[PDB]
């Protein structure tokens, strides 16, 4: 596991998670992927699309943490492999508020480094 | 291959190798370990050790780039292993000017991310 990258994601997820809520409409709801073994690659494509959604509806400019999280998600090469990979649709995930969206985003990124 | 960490090195190396020379005495010299297959581990410890000799020779006691470089090396877990490993001696390497030192250093980190 690349400790250098997990450490930047740690700093970036702490600074980004703290300012949000108050930076977004309470009415903002985002699709929040889980860590089901056979859909991690879907789960990552959906986390990325909805970060974009979080962009256009939130006062997140120009967050150093946000564009670190975002560009990190698109360039890092994760092990998204399993016995039986499947496709999952973004809109079939739960919506939730911003605080739990990145929280779940963190948990997913950690899982990916764990393997 | 951890593209997030490699890009943080790349930028930190470019934003340092290009500023340096100007930031050190023209007569500064450093021992520059190379990438012999069986001396990777040594080569790492001497690189870190001459970073310190460069920390008092020049400014760089601060510097976002220098700290990221230095901290990356002591905390990232490397595959420095071989079938016939050997203990190299830092002062048995070639001494070089500060800019070439960081170039070789960039070459040693690229190699260890390739394996």
């Amino acid at each position: 596991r690349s400790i250098i990258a997990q450490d930047m994601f740690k700093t970036a997820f702490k600074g980004f998670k703290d300012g949000i809520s108050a930076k977004c409409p309470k009415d903002t709801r985002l699709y929040s992927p889980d860590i089901q073994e056979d859909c991690l690659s879907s789960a990552l494509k959906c986390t990325i699309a909805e970060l974009k959604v979080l962009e256009v509806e939130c006062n997140v400019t120009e967050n150093d943490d946000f564009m670190m999280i975002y560009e990190g998600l698109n360039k890092e090469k994760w092990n998204t492999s399993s016995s039986s990979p499947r496709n999952c649709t973004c809109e079939l995930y739960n919506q939730t508020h911003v605080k739990e969206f990145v929280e779940n985003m963190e948990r997913l990124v950690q899982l990916l480094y764990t393997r």
Side-chain angles (χ1 to χ4, degrees), chain A residues 8-87:
Chain A
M8 334 182 160
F9 271 121
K10 205 179 163 188
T11 68
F13 279 143
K14 186 201 199 115
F16 181 61
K17 143 171 36 180
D18 179 43
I20 46 95
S21 318
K23 282 194 241 324
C24 295
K26 192 102 157 210
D27 301 321
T28 295
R29 294 245 291 177
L30 288 175
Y31 293 114
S32 163
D34 57 38
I35 49 167
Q36 298 289 352
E37 295 161 333
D38 299 314
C39 263
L40 302 158
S41 156
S42 268
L44 193 90
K45 297 208 191 105
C46 298
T47 308
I48 286 166
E50 290 275 289
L51 275 178
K52 271 165 173 311
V53 179
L54 194 163
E55 221 177 346
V56 314
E57 320 188 339
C58 296
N59 192 12
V60 63
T61 183
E62 211 197 19
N63 212 283
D64 271 3
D65 306 353
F66 170 80
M67 297 224 74
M68 187 287 201
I69 290 153
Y70 179 81
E71 295 173 328
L73 287 178
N74 270 281
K75 75 175 173 181
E76 187 74 316
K77 279 224 305 196
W78 311 100
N79 184 236
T80 59
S81 61
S82 75
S83 315
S84 204
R86 307 285 224 285
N87 276 116

